[PDB]
Amino acid sequence: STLYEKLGGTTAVDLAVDKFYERVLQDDRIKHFFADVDMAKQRAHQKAFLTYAFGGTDKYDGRYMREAHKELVENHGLNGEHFDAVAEDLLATLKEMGVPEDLIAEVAAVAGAPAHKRDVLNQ
């Protein structure tokens, strides 16, 4: 039911979040969206993205998502291409960790949920 059950406990979740953070950090498509934020904050974001994706959606109200990403949309040019890149990066990380493909699809449908994409992009 929770993230730690899905992935096999606290080490495993740390592994997932660290790998995801590392991949986004190296991704020239999206790294500039975090340029005005420190490294702990960037990590906390990848944790939040992953947590959401695994189905702790309820922590993140769409109204809060709209507001949280508004400056990205208005000031950094955030668009659907960038959105898809973060989601892609998560799935690549999970695949590298050995996460079963059925779990990967579950999380991909949540991470790329049209309602969430609309909120994040302020559409």
Ligand code: HEM
């Ligand atoms: C998609 C699954 C998605 C969610 C969920 C999400 C959450 C989220 C929250 C809760 C914050 C607020 C953090 C705070 O402490 O104020 C937040 C912040 C930022 N996000 Fe995000 N976010 C999701 C998706 C995306 C995507 C696709 C991008 C693309 C670059 C992105 C970016 C950012 C940025 C930048 C911030 C602000 C900096 C930060 O505080 O981390 N998010 N997001």
Ligand SMILES: O=S([O-])[O-]
């Ligand atoms: O231990 S938490 O900051 O991923």
